[PDB]
Amino acid sequence: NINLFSSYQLGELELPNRIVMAPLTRSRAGEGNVPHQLNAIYYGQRASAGLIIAEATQVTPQGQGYPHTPGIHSPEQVAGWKLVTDTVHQQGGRIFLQLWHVGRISHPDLQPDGGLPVAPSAIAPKGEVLTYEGKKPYVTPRALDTSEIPAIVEQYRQGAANALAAGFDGVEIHAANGYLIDQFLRDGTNQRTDEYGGAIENRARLLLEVTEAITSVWDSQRVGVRLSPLTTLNGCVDSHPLETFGYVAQALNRFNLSYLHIFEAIDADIRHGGTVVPTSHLRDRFTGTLIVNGGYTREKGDTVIANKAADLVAFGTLFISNPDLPERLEVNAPLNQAKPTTFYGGGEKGYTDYPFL
Ligand SMILES: Cc1cc2nc3c(=O)[nH]c(=O)nc-3n(C[C@H](O)[C@H](O)[C@H](O)COP(=O)(O)O)c2cc1C
Ligand SMILES: [Cl-]
């Protein structure tokens, strides 16, 4: 009898429960995009999670797309992240860093020397993007040269090496939500005509090469990957999600990863008139630990574990508002209500001041 409170063996890590804190961008980094003591308090308050996945963290300056997100490319950033991992470890928790590059979802104002965002193909996102001077129209990203792809892979390798020096327990590759890797994955954002575009094995190549590089730094059982097969976020869609994502699920087995993490889009059924990509399709193809996410509750999480449909269940929104989410779920306590106005930016309010039971 397994449920949301069963322990789990994730490589050498002993998880006390199956509850994961999903990665959550909070945009509360200081000068130089460096984490600080407030961030350490925030993660320390949530250390009862089976596993924390820290917010998306850019691996290189050009990988930033929103003001005040932390990076993992500089020594000052490693030192600030050390404050966080030290606090989490003091509180008996475990934490992985989510490794980010936004690709086209950025603006020159956020880029070194005011340069263009990079991407697989020169396709401007629609609408406006937040800068330090409010919202401005997106521009068109520069399509990377074939010869530049190794430099991208190397930025991820260095980001993963920095995470290791910062004292994380592992890393998660952000291959979801329409950011750089996802932009290569999906045919809606990738119309390249080299070995990184066209056929599925080409579109998956960047993910696979990034994963290979990162497993040269970390033991593979401390490296996860996140996918979001049916998001439409950031204008990133694939025309054959079942085949695309079913292929990636199988291709990742080579690496003996920590886990595959699926964000199941909350609006996919209502948009698509049904389910184009049941998570079972991926559960059956990826042979290791599966984390599922999107709108879970105590009862929904228990069910998926009991049914063997997933091993771990990640909660995003509820972990914003309930630092002791595991205990509250365990005893069927009232949950605090999440306050969207304070999700992004600011300080303690709506960040470290949600109460414990
Ligand atoms: C404020 C906020 C920030 C998020 N930031 C990230 C992020 O940094 N990386 C990521 O992969 N997903 C991110 N997401 C998506 C969440 O991790 C999660 O997949 C989503 O909220 C659905 O799960 P939930 O219903 O438990 O909240 C974010 C969502 C929210 C609400
Ligand atoms: Cl995200």
Numbering used by the authors: 14 to 370
Pull verbatim passages from the article behind this deposition:
To generalize this engineering approach for crystal contacts, a non-ADH-homologous enzyme was selected to apply the established strategies to the Nostoc sp. PCC 1720 ene reductase (NostocER). This oxidoreductase from the old yellow enzyme family (OYE, EC 1.6.99.1) catalyzes the trans-hydrogenations of activated alkenes, demonstrating its industrial relevance as a biocatalyst. As OYEs are strongly dependent on cost-intensive NADPH as a cofactor, Mähler et al. engineered NADH-accepting variants (NostocER1) by exchanging NostocER loop regions at cofactor-binding sites to ER loop regions from Achromobacter sp. JA81 and Acaryochloris marina with a higher NADH affinity. For this study, the NostocER1 Loop1,5 variant (NostocER1-L1,5) was selected as an example protein for the rational introduction of Lys–Glu interactions at crystal contacts to demonstrate the impact of rational single amino acid exchanges on the crystallizability of proteins and enhance protein crystallization.
Reducing the protein concentration from 10 g L−1 to 5 g L−1 led to a decrease in the crystal amount for all the tested NspER1-L1,5 variants, with D352K being the mutant that formed crystals of the smallest size but in the highest amount. Mutants D352K and T354K crystallizing in the same space group P1211 as the wild type showed, again, an excellent agreement in crystal packing. The crystal contact at position D352K is not conform to expectations and is quite complex, with more than one amino acid residue interacting with D352K within approx. 10 Å. A sodium ion (lilac) also seemed to participate in the interaction complex. Introducing a lysine at any of the neighboring NspER1-L1,5 positions Q350, (D352), and T354 led to an interaction with the intermolecular amino acid residue of E25/27. The neighboring NspER1-L1,5 mutants Q350K, D352K, and T354K led to an interaction with intermolecular E25/27 and an increase in crystallizability (Section 3.2, Section 3.3 and Section 3.4), with the strongest impact for T354K. Validating the molecular structure of the NspER1-L1,5 mutants, for 67% (4/6) of the analyzed crystal structures, the correct intermolecular interaction partner was assumed (except for D352K; and Q263K: E146 instead of E44, data not shown).
